[PDB]
Design goal:
Distance between the termini of chain A: 41 Å
Helix content of chain A: 10-25%
Catalytic activity (chains A, B, C, D, E): uridylyl-uridylyl-ribonucleotide-RNA = a 3'-end uridylyl-2',3'-cyclophospho-uridine-RNA + a 5'-end dephospho-ribonucleoside-RNA
Domain NendoU (chains A, B, C, D, E): 211-348
Shape of chain A: globular
Domain AV-Nsp11N/CoV-Nsp15M (chains A, B, C, D, E): 63-183
Largest interface: A-B, 40 and 38 residues
Cofactor (chains A, B, C, D, E): Mn(2+)
Number of strands of chain A: 19
Oligomer: part of a larger assembly
Number of domains of chain A: 3
Active site (chains A, B, C, D, E): 241, 256, 296
Radius of gyration of chain A: 23 Å
Order of helices and strands of chain A: HEEEHHEEEEHEEEEEEHHHHEEEHEEE
Number of helices of chain A: 9
Structural class of chain A: alpha+beta
Chain lengths: 348, 348, 348, 348, 348
């Protein structure tokens, strides 16, 4: 596919259709200008690491169908996608830095030992998976003939986080292979051995449009801390520090759950900075509190349904000084630092 | 006019005054940096197709006075503007890709057969028009001595859509020439022969700040569909599909009127993508519905006062399968696809 | 410090820690791409006048601690900062165009006669100040042994305007030297001789989030002009024009106080354009009023607590035609144009 | 034609054949990289004023057939070429800044009043010429039915200056139209009226490979000035100054004929600088003489067969102080400054 | 001076005249395009570290008059030039990275403690020098009232190395100040104390056009090594290794004098690579010998008149193992490594 042909589809199909046709173009810097109706117009601006003309082609051939949020594929260490390409609207670029059977200019020659992502919706996908060494196979339907584990009921659809697709709930089932064997998932136990049940998933919310998803979260959003801490006997769980956050010093104390930041945002403006942005289970922001002048260079925030978080803490028999607890979130074991006082998610 | 002199006016006059003076500059990539008070500052960022230094000059000499929204000049196929230059704040660049008597670097040598835009507010404008082969002449006042047609009562003022200028209503009158003859406008009939009255104009609204402009639109915004469809006996007009839109499938059904998208936006987040952006009567978005996961790659939306739209449909004696109806909007004949079921504006 | 090491700190410390470590990078245009977890990500986009790799280093070593808003350092004509670097989040770049003891690539060799900024929080700062010819020394604590003047109780903290730092009020004391002498500040008089008390400071508010800070301002925001003008016998002060602004003509009349623009914004959309953006006591916008179509290319706005403004006008014995009054704001003498009718802040 | 298709022809045909096929590409800055045999290679570097992708297309579609040297088309003021494009290997870019029926991105819409170049070798060329207002028509054969004037017997063939094409002498005949009339060439008279016979043509030689073309030139190259000046009684013609050049002062005296510079180059290294480079009858160099340290910022050199030059001077009845003589060279009237002492070609 | 005005002078004066006039321009990347005669032409290509528009201005205002070769000003550690700017045609950029009273965009504010270069040919130059702390003052004439030292009889004239200027020998006299005192030069002694007479100067020759300058050098160029080594009883001076160079191993042995490289070039092709190029007394090349396959990554070459070199070695009472000798060349003390075997110029 040529540049003019790519630029043609982007403009007439909304992505790569494979339809015939050309449109006059000009690549100026990161700008891709299309001459349309004799008037020049910028149709794509390049913020990927690829050459502009190439970059517009990847973007033009991005998945326009729903798929598991990329943080999950990050946690699974996907090296490349088989016959398709994912776009990180958070990253404002392509997901994997490599392509396969997608773009002549970037497609790798060998992906043998790489950890490959196969979408059951692509023809040949499943046959490819069954023969690969390392990879993840996904399907919107549970295959009885594949050992599989179900993911959260939400997905990335053109960068939007949806929980339904045509009012039908989002469903995804994962199958995995490593060193040429099929990882056998079973109903119980922990996904990863010591170094949990692999059932916890981040909520995927934006501070700009946060929303409570349980009667408890709602109670967090509308009840004074003391009141709320009482209703759920969170008494001895340092929630004040860890989830509400303290703004009396120069360094913000705690503030590790997203919902906490949302609650703050209600009375005080919270300016978040993030130099490394893309879908990830745990974020690392540079927070500054407008009303107190308090702040923190590196403050990790994770968006867990408050309910889930409260249990994680209850399951903790916090009677040990500096204990390093492992919490499996989004199919991965993340470790949390736990002094009988603060409980924070480490910069793993 | 030199770069330093342009950069001087931009900074002291707010556009090109023609006043004398220089300011030290540096053109770095698309950036134009002015050394002001010994401190370097970016005063212009280039997203046009021209060389940065040139681009800042065009922008500096942009029309700071009101004028007809560019989609209208698009519909009239204006090739270039006579002695002035228009800026598309939607496009974030210059309107026509060519200039005339404006910028030494870009001004064309011959615009004889081109379709020229003459503003009666420019000296020599009218004399130039009367001698051109193809062009449009505009004036805020109706000239008794020119055959003219009145445009909508709104205008582009620095990219803002206004309906008054000093609390005085916006008024524009168009005169047109083709193959050296004056197009003679008359009170009745259709602007274009079969292939209507040329009195329909898009509303120019932003989904971000939509606003009802008739008691009917308001009723659309606040009454349940069923209720509303009843009050106006829209019974047999498929409004459900076409104007409210259906989100039960994977592909959004209908959703072709802007006000419809606004109404949705009330309960569900609608993420619109548009690769080709500039003022145009009909837009083509890549819509995705956040609450249902429904979406459509190419979904054309036009912003017609709902009232006008309801008549367009009533005038339709929809008793014919696949009929292709022509609707003259913004001085141009756009064709709409009409099955006894869906009525959509084609990607003309 | 190397690029990889800078890019490492930015990502792990949130700024320059001086910690060891490298991260693979790629400088593409103004983009700085970090290869993280085998996935390429843009961590910095260059809009400064420096070479991209250099620019990320300055930004990485920006002051993450509170400091006086830059307009104040602008008014004091600071040429360079001693051993530290300030970032203008408004400018989206570095403050001074020069560096000193901060970046090998940009640090000047001699800053002898330059006007230097010394922060008492930097080791060696005060000793350096006491020996410089021209410079300003600042400290969060009032030094009994230095002649000093107190600044406003607010500060730039990572670009956010705070009035507390750990719920403790912001405090800054300035010491100044010129031609090798210490400027001796005294309790009374005017900071600058004729060409006032040097106690007036702009409020630092954003039209996007304006907020009344006195019962008077609140009354301006909620009482009809006539009503309000009465409650404070502003009768003969042309407030209508100057502070409320007139929108009946093509050229906006008056409109020189920020709070005035905020009040407007309540019923009419005010689109502000500003080609030269950075923290400055007086701004120069290109305003356009959406509801009236009125506008002005160059319209200077200053954000003074309305209370302070009302006195400035009262102190004026406006009984003289074209009198040019000097008003000392933010440690600097700005001149205002005053006809018995309009009172505007000049484009000094 | 797409980028990949252009890049394909350049690589397989050596220019634009119109053959089908694509090659993977990447446009990085002014570089055009082709992925060939899985190895990336730069096939074109952009030093034109167009966007890189566009620039390679023009170059790919350059005239690979012989044609009159561009200085001649410069002297005739050609604005654009009809259905073909010329490449200035001196300029290292395209000739005219505009194209017509050659490149969708750059082809002008109207060339009506422009001065057009029609090549009789292009189909439709002659019919187009006969209908244009202003233009030049060329043909390798003398058309009995067109008023025509013959040009020099040499041509630009891929940037090389040839005098034969398949051992057959180069031949070109020019036909011209202005204000819709055919310029009628006759055997005698002067091409341009006072403000000569239009038979003088520059020799097209490179100082790097200069070569005598008459027994006289050879005698200039091998006989001492005095000797040579005698053999041709050039006694009273200031040849010393004007053609041999004087190097005793700080400013080179004379030195206006190319052959003169070549002769010098024999014993002293002459470093020529030229900021505006392309085929032009008269050059303007910044000469510096290595052996004497003499030099001149602006020193105009023209390459006339010494024989022709000697007559031009003889025809001059130099008995007048400051007389400004017109000399028609390469179909154009260039004026020469003539004091009874120095005779130099002006920077017309 | 504006861009258009700079571009105008470059084109009509050959450098900056200060004459009035503009030329349309376009800055594309490092390219500066001038629209001349309606045809776009590149007049300057930017390989300096400055922004293109700025870079063309410096180049346009370069010294077109003779001056001491830059390596000498390098050896004197000149930080900036007073009221003028030097161009390194070797470097293909500006000499000092800073300017003073030359370019608004780059001129430093304070050069007080910097080491300044004052040219006696600039008005005010000498008065400026007499008041500076650290600097060098130069004059083509020996001032009886200034302590001065004479430099070599050759100069950089537009990048060409000349020994005459209008057949008059090149002459330069240096005056120097440090810590506010005038360095007092006397007839005898060593310029620098231990850590010689300051009368040795490199020859400034190009391997491409090397030329013997003494009957001895000529004898080196035409006599077999053995023969030559005999005629000058160079017997015990390892000249074989050090000056002729050995090519029998993989690492070239010796080869530190330029004339040696020239002699080689006679029978074997010597490919020199140099990553850091500009006028410097000692070069560091990456040499590879075509006929023997021998080579050396870092091989320092200095161009001394062979005669001078032979004495330097004779003055050496080489009877000491690893002695580090200091040799003052081009006004600077460079140290040479000297084992009773090899004598090489260190990478100081």
């Amino acid at each position: 596919s040529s540049l003019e042909n790519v630029v043609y589809n982007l403009v007439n199909a909304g992505h790569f259709d494979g339809r015939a046709g050309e449109l006059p173009c000009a690549v100026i810097g990161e700008k891709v200008i299309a001459k349309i109706q004799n008037e020049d117009v910028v149709v794509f601006k390049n913020n990927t690491p690829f050459p502009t003309n190439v970059a517009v082609e990847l973007f033009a051939k991005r998945s326009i169908r729903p798929h598991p949020e990329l943080k999950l594929f990050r946690n699974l260490n996907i090296d490349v996608c088989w016959s398709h390409v994912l776009w990180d609207y958070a990253k404002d670029s392509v997901f994997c830095s490599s392509t396969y059977k997608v773009c002549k200019y970037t497609d790798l020659q060998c992906i043998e030992s790489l950890n490959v992502l196969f979408d059951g919706r692509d023809n040949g996908a499943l046959e490819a998976f069954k023969k690969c060494r390392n990879g993840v196979y996904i399907n919107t339907t549970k295959i009885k003939s594949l050992s599989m584990i179900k993911g959260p009921q939400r997905a990335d659809l053109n960068g939007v986080v949806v929980e339904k697709v045509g009012d039908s709930d989002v469903e995804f089932w994962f199958a995995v292979r490593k060193d040429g064997d099929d990882v056998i998932f079973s109903r119980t136990g922990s996904l990863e051995p010591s170094h949990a049940r692999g059932t916890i998933f981040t909520q995927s919310r934006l501070l700009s449009s946060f929303t409570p998803r349980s009667e408890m979260e709602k109670d967090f959003m509308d009840l004074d801390d003391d009141v709320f801490i009482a209703k759920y006997s969170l008494q001895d769980y340092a929630f004040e520090h860890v989830v509400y956050g303290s703004f009396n010093q120069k360094i913000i104390g705690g503030l590790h759950l997203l919902i906490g930041l949302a609650r703050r945002q209600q009375k005080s403006n919270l300016v978040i900075q993030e130099f490394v942005t893309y879908d990830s289970s745990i974020h690392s922001y540079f927070i500054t509190d407008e009303n107190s002048g308090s702040s923190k260079s590196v403050c990790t925030v994770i968006d867990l349904l408050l309910d889930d978080f409260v249990d994680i803490v209850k399951s903790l028999n916090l009677k040990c000084v500096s204990k390093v607890v492992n919490v499996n979130v989004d199919f991965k074991d993340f470790q949390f630092m736990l002094w009988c006082n603060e409980e924070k998610v480490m910069t793993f």
